[PDB]
Ligand binder design. Structure first.
Ligand SMILES: *[C@@H]1O[C@H](CO)[C@@H](O[C@@H]2O[C@H](CO)[C@@H](O[C@@H]3O[C@H](CO[C@H]4O[C@H](CO[C@H]5O[C@H](CO)[C@@H](O)[C@H](O)[C@@H]5O)[C@@H](O)[C@H](O)[C@@H]4O)[C@@H](O)[C@H](O[C@H]4O[C@H](CO)[C@@H](O)[C@H](O)[C@@H]4O[C@H]4O[C@H](CO)[C@@H](O)[C@H](O)[C@@H]4O[C@H]4O[C@H](CO)[C@@H](O)[C@H](O)[C@@H]4O)[C@@H]3O)[C@H](O)[C@H]2NC(C)=O)[C@H](O)[C@H]1NC(C)=O
Lengths: 76, 367, 511
């Protein structure tokens, strides 16, 4: 699905959605295939802490008609 | 690479047919076909799922079945042939209506039920005394090496219902005709009316080459493929007839099966190049009386590997409404090419190649 | 009509079955199947002394399966005594218990009978019935029947016998010709052997109907290939019991040789044999009646056949059969054990046809000139050319009669074929008799244009006469006729695969 990824957005789970959007940069991690993204947290996460984040992705062309051909009456 | 995939569906009126015809199925399986055996009446039978074909080849060894199970129907089989699938049909005196209807769509006319081919002069000595088991001479066999095999064949035994090819349909192939004395009629009932098939008009085996190149073979006799005929010796009842150790049924059956399943005679057309002489690219428009070079490449499928075609009779045409120029294409450098001067009349001309030969796939190219 | 046996062991089949039994031994079970199966057919082992030693070496006293196979195989072998320990006797008796399968009871009881060890037959039956109540499968039931055949008559075998009616109902029928269980050929052959063997020992006739037994044997013999030793042994036992038993003997009746062309000899010979192809020499045969297919009236009745060697022959020189098909009803009499004793066979009488007084003539279509007729007779071909054209028509007249009797004949096939010598085309016409039974054919060029496609030329003329009953079909070149149709006032499709004519372009000349 990496080729078909139209957009990626990350925001922290909080009331301040407008300000909770996180900066994301495309990154390549050595030795591992596939696209990766580096997300900068608003505050550093110290040992033993947790945070909740929401990741949204949109893919294009991932739905393929089957059967390929239909008549006027036939459904999709 | 086989033009038709190995997936084959076999329809049997009775399961016992597989045992009786073990030799034919084993020879087919040895060639890498993936056979699946289902009863012809079985409800689960289906050919098309979601617009795709479940099977590439269909063999209907179900002469007596009145109706097909599940969704299989004469319309469905017709669509399947249009898709390019190869179909084999075997008939008998018990022929049900669907088989006759299928022949009607293909232009091969089966005779009425209970009729049989009667030959009083060439019937085998082993016949029950009804003169319906006829020893078919190899002379009637069609003169097509690709379809029937180059090798010579011994006399073949046929017992079944005669069929007549429709004159109107050009594509019909008279693979095996009956003897001059043979005719199709009800044996018990006297011949008041004119026979449905008389003399050499009667057809025992016929083939069809569709415009899409689908191939279907109709056999009058299911028993012809039976193991019993394959091993049985043949001697004509009439006096002075030699006795042959083995029949030619097995060898002929193998050759026909190869032809139906696109194992022989398959041809493909590759890139065609035209340009002005001395030029490497085609001009947008040519001038009057200019000299141009035309090149095309054709291939043949041998043993599943494409190779340069050896055909020497290929003819090129330059046409506007009627053919202004026609000439043979020379075989040079693995390609067929010719150089000629354009006519003095301007217009929207088309280059045409129409190499259609008996038993081979029909090739048409237009630029 | 009673059902005739459709499958049986022919003389070739019985020998092939013996070969299938006569295979090298690989295990005690193999020895039991081969040796016992041959014994049932009456065949012997060439190396019987070696076979007994082989059983002795492989016999394990602590294994029930070995004991059963060794005991039966040794019993089949002559004088094949094998040492048995007391511990073996305890093992066989212990095997017969409520906590062991019916199959186990069968092996233990059979082993005891073969060795001759004493057994408590009543106790063995009590264990067998108790296990059989849970083990209601067909295979368990058949083994129980065999166990009863080994148990003493004092035991209450009636309970075991009652299963036989249940099994017969449980049989699956293919419709009027075959009866077999779902388990296949092996179960049917064993069941027939068990039913006959148990019933013979008990002294009561099998309850199975004679027609049902005929169907059951047909299923057993439907397939003539026995791949495994077990299949051969079971079938051999079934054939042996059927061949000779106290109640039912299947009577196979078939005509020897082809009766289609019987007119040459006018002798009918019928083979009468059992399922093993052994002729029933003690039987007597008679032709109950003979009927004509055409009218259904009897022509002969109550004429007895004579035993001539193996076959039964009936002479009918006195009666001059007319051309046609006749059906003979024959009955086998004598031993009461015979089943399916009545068989119906169809014989055909042939004759030869003579064509005489054929006159080939040409007539002026307007009738101004009297018809010109040239007399011809088969096979002498007509001399000279006959013209059929816009002015003169052509006609054929011939009479068909039986050579032997001179009666009028109407052959099923009577066609006139005109073959174009140059093209090779053939045109076939059907000739029909008139009221007087003289065939008349007329050729009119103007009307017949559609049939010939108005294709003029010389055509060889042939007479085709044939019928199923006719000994001598005739294809005669009667004459040569030239047909000239009216000249046409004014085809390339057939050249589907040919080079087309070369076409060139004529460039305009320079000024
Ligand atoms: C406006 O639009 C109109 C609509 O199209 C245009 O009208 C068209 O004009 C073209 C050009 O003239 C016509 O084609 C020509 O027609 C000629 C007359 O037709 C004869 O053909 C009949 C054939 O009958 C059957 O033939 C076969 C049988 O199997 C079958 O396939 C076919 O379908 C048909 O049923 C024949 O019986 C009658 O005689 C007819 O009169 C016809 O002769 C021309 O054929 C020529 O040319 C064509 C190429 O165009 C070749 O394919 C032919 O083989 C043949 O070629 C020979 O003649 C040429 C000149 O005629 C030469 O250049 C060739 O080299 C070659 O030479 C040989 O023959 C010469 C004599 O013919 C000899 O001198 C030589 O020595 C050689 O032997 C051609 O078909 C269309 O018919 C016509 N269509 C209509 C609907 O009317 C009109 O032009 C437009 N107007 C303007 C101003 O633009």
């Amino acid at each position: 699905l990496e080729a078909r990824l139209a957009h990626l957005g990350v925001q922290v789970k909080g009331e301040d959605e407008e300000e909770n959007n996180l900066e994301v940069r495309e990154t390549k991690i050595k030795g591992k295939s596939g696209r990766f993204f580096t997300v900068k947290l608003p505050v550093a996460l110290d040992p033993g802490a947790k945070i909740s984040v929401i990741v949204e992705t949109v893919y294009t062309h991932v739905l393929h008609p089957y059967p390929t051909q239909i008549t006027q009456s036939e459904k999709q | 690479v086989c033009a038709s995939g190995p997936r084959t569906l076999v329809l049997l009126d009775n399961l016992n047919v597989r045992e009786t015809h073990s030799l034919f199925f084993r020879s087919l399986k040895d060639r890498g076909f993936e056979l699946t055996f289902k009863t012809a009446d079985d409800p689960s039978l289906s050919l098309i799922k979601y617009g795709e074909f479940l099977y590439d080849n269909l063999i209907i060894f179900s002469p007596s079945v009145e109706d097909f199970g599940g969704n299989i129907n004469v319309e469905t089989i017709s669509a399947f042939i249009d898709g390019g699938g190869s179909v084999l049909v075997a008939a008998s005196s018990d022929i049900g209506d669907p088989l006759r209807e299928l022949g009607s769509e293909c232009g091969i006319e089966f005779d009425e039920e209970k009729t049989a081919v009667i030959d009083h002069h060439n019937y085998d000595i082993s016949d029950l005394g009804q003169h319906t088991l006829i020893v078919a001479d190899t002379e009637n066999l069609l003169k097509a090496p690709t379809i029937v095999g180059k090798s010579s064949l011994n006399p073949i035994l046929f017992r079944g219902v005669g069929m007549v090819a429709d004159p109107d349909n050009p594509l019909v192939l008279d693979i095996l005709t009956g003897s001059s004395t043979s005719y199709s009629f009800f044996p018990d009932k006297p011949i008041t009316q004119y026979p449905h098939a008389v003399g050499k008009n009667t057809l025992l085996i016929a083939g069809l080459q569709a415009r899409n190149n689908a191939r279907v073979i109709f056999s009058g006799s299911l028993d012809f493929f039976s193991d019993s005929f394959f091993n049985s010796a043949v001697q004509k009842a009439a006096p002075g007839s030699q006795r042959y150790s083995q029949t030619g049924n097995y060898e002929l059956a193998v050759a026909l099966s190869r032809w139906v399943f696109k194992e022989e005679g398959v041809l493909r057309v590759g890139p065609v190049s035209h340009h002005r002489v001395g030029e490497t690219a085609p001009p947008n428009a040519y001038t009057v009386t200019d000299l141009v070079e035309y090149s095309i490449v054709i291939q043949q499928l041998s043993n599943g590997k494409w190779v340069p075609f050896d055909g020497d009779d290929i003819q090129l045409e330059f046409v506007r409404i009627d053919p202004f120029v026609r000439t043979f294409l020379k075989k040079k450098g693995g390609k067929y090419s010719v150089q000629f001067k354009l006519p003095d009349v301007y217009g929207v001309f088309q280059f045409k190649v129409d190499y259609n030969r008996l038993g081979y796939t029909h090739l048409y190219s237009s630029t | 009509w009673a059902l005739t046996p459709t499958h049986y062991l022919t003389k070739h089949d019985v020998e092939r079955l013996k070969a299938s039994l006569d295979r090298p031994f690989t295990n005690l079970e193999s020895a039991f199947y081969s040796i016992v199966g041959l014994s049932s057919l009456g065949a012997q082992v060439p190396d019987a002394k070696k076979a007994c030693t082989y059983i002795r070496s492989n016999l394990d006293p602590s294994n029930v399966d070995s004991l059963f196979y060794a005991a039966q195989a040794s019993q089949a072998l002559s004088g094949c005594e094998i040492s048995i320990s007391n511990e073996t006797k305890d093992l066989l008796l212990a095997a017969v218990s409520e906590d062991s399968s019916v199959t186990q009871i069968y092996h233990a009881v059979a082993a005891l009978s073969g060795f001759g060890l004493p057994l408590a037959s009543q106790e063995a039956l009590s264990a067998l019935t108790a296990r059989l109540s849970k083990e209601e499968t067909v295979l368990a039931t058949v083994q129980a029947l065999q166990t009863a055949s080994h148990l003493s008559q004092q035991a209450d075998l009636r309970s075991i016998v009652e299963e036989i009616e249940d099994l017969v109902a449980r049989l699956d029928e293919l419709g009027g010709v075959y009866l077999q269980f779902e388990e296949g050929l092996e179960t049917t052959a064993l069941f027939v052997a068990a039913t006959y063997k148990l019933m013979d020992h008990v002294g009561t006739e099998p309850s199975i109907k004679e027609d049902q037994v005929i169907q059951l044997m047909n299923a057993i013999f439907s397939k003539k290939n026995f791949e495994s030793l077990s299949e051969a042994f079971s079938v051999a036992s079934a054939a042996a019991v059927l061949s000779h038993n106290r109640y039912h003997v299947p009577v196979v009746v078939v005509p020897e040789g082809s009766a289609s062309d019987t007119h040459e000899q006018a002798i009918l010979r019928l083979q009468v044999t059992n399922v093993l192809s052994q002729p029933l020499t003690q039987a007597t045969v008679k032709l109950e009646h003979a009927k004509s297919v055409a009218s259904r009236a009897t022509v002969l009745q109550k004429t007895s056949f004579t035993p001539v060697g193996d076959v039964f022959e009936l002479n009918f020189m006195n009666v001059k059969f007319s051309s046609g098909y006749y059906d003979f009803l024959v009955e086998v009499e004598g031993d009461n054990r015979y089943i399916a004793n009545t068989v119906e066979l169809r014989v055909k009488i042939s004759t030869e046809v003579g064509i005489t007084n054929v006159d080939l003539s040409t007539v002026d279509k307007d009738q101004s000139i009297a018809p010109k007729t040239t007399r011809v007779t088969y096979p002498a071909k007509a001399k000279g050319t006959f013209i059929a054209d816009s002015h003169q028509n052509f006609a054929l007249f011939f009479q068909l009669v039986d050579v032997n009797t001179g009666a009028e004949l109407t052959p099923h096939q009577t066609f006139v074929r005109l073959h174009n010598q140059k093209t090779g085309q053939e045109v076939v016409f059907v000739a029909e008799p008139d009221n007087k039974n003289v065939y008349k054919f007329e050729l009119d060029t103007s009307e017949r244009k559609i049939e010939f496609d108005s294709a003029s030329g010389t055509y060889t003329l042939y007479l085709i006469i044939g019928d199923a009953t006719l000994k001598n079909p005739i294809l005669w070149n009667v004459a040569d006729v030239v047909i000239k149709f009216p000249e046409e006032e004014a085809v390339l499709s057939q050249n589907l695969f040919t080079p087309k004519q070369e076409i060139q372009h004529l460039f305009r000349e320079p000024e």
